[PDB]
Write a protein that binds this ligand. Structure first.
Ligand code: I44
Length: 163
């Protein structure tokens, strides 16, 4: 079965709730495993305590830069980056979970959750999961974003793991 993982998120130290994500290990096993292991911290590093550092209304909420917390960093469980596994799954609508990158073959740890259909990212960002519960939490995160992506409050993944 595809793994389910969670992100528990605060805004300014106030809980927003839990996002439940299904990882499509059937289609993108390697990309799904990276995210799963970063949620559990099993390699000695991962998402716990890091932030949603770029949140753009009517676009997406981006997180996972646990080295620099600013969108320039992060790393994968396989090394500093790994190639795009495939582009099979598409940016079909809100709730899509997809890998951030700095161009081709630069997947590390940064990821995003879409709040609209981001079809122009098809073939450029590897989709690997979807929100199955807590989309309302994602909408709360989105409400603290801005056109530049700078957040109005400190949005923190206080805990995460595998369900
Ligand atoms: N209301 C409606 C609004 O509609 C507007 C629509 N806007 C859209 O379509 C927009 C239009 C185009 N602008 C953008 O690309 C926005 C870019 C942006 O913010 N920075 C700020 C952060 C830094 C930069 C540049 C930089 C500087 C140093 C090192 C690396 C990059 C630029 C970046 O690029 N960092 C990646 C994140 C990442 C991910 C993984 C790694 C990594 O492991 C690694 C990389 C290399 C070697 C080893 C490891 C590093 C960085 C970033 O953030 N990628 C952008 C992104 C992220 C998620 C989803 C999509 C998109 C595309 C987008 O945003 N496209």
């Amino acid at each position: 079965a595809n793994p389910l993982v969670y992100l528990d998120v605060d805004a300014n130290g106030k809980p927003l709730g839990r996002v439940v994500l299904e990882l499509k290990a059937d289609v993108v096993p390697k990309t799904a495993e990276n995210f799963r292991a970063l949620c559990t911290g099993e390699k000695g590093f991962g998402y716990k305590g890091s932030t949603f550092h770029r949140v753009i209304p009517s676009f997406m909420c981006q997180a996972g830069d646990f080295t620099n917390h600013n969108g320039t960093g992060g790393k994968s469980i396989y090394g500093s980056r790994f190639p795009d596994e495939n582009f099979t799954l598409k940016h079909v609508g809100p709730g899509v979970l997809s890998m951030a990158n700095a161009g081709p073959n630069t997947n590390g740890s940064q990821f995003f959750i879409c709040t609209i259909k981001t079809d122009w990212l098809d073939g450029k960002h590897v989709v690997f999961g979807h929100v199955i519960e807590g989309m309302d939490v994602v909408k709360k995160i989105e409400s603290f974003g801005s056109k530049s992506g700078r957040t109005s409050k400190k949005i923190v993944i206080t805990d995460c793991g595998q369900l």
